Amino acid sequence: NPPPPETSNPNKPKRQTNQLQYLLRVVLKTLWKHQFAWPFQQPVDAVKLNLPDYYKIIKTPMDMGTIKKRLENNYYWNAQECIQDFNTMFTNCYIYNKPGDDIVLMAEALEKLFLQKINELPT
Numbered sequence: 001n002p003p004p005p006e007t008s009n010p011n012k013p014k015r016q017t018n019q020l021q022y023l024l025r026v027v028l029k030t031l032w033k034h035q036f037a038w039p040f041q042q043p044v045d046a047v048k049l050n051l052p053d054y055y056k057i058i059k060t061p062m063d064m065g066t067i068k069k070r071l072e073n074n075y076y077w078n079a080q081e082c083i084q085d086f087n088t089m090f091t092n093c094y095i096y097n098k099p100g101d102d103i104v105l106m107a108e109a110l111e112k113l114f115l116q117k118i119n120e121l122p123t
């Protein structure tokens with residue numbers, strides 16, 4: 001396993017924004033409770049899960065546990081940065097797998113709920 005993504009960085013500029021507040025309180029916390037959320041709640045453990053080729057293929061890993069901690073820690077400057085982390089988590093799943101796989105059916109469901117929730121954000 002490689003080191004997981006950072007959740008703190010003192011030299012990074014950050015802001016507390018009403019859209020970032022919403023991304024934590026509503027968007028992340030709703031997805032988290034979905035029946036298909038559990039494979040995405042922490043970094044991939046290629047050793048436990050016996051996926052030795054995962055980090056040989058995926059070079060920008062991301063997961064909802066990392067996002068949650070970034071949100072709680074005031075890591076982001078704006079909502080587009082957080083939205084980009086979500087998009088990376090979903091794209092990684094489609095790169096490493098194939099259409100029809102159980103994990104892909106799960107990611108497709110969460111991605112549609114995610115887009116429904118960010119369709120309208122607070123001003």
Ligand SMILES: CCN1C(=O)c2cccc3c(S(=O)(=O)N4CCC[C@@H]4CO)ccc1c23
Binds near residue numbers: 044
């Ligand atoms: C989202 C990150 N991510 C992948 O890209 C991926 C590829 C193959 C299996 C898994 C598993 S799992 O073995 O625990 N399991 C969970 C249900 C489906 C799958 C078994 O079919 C958990 C998380 C994963 C994968």
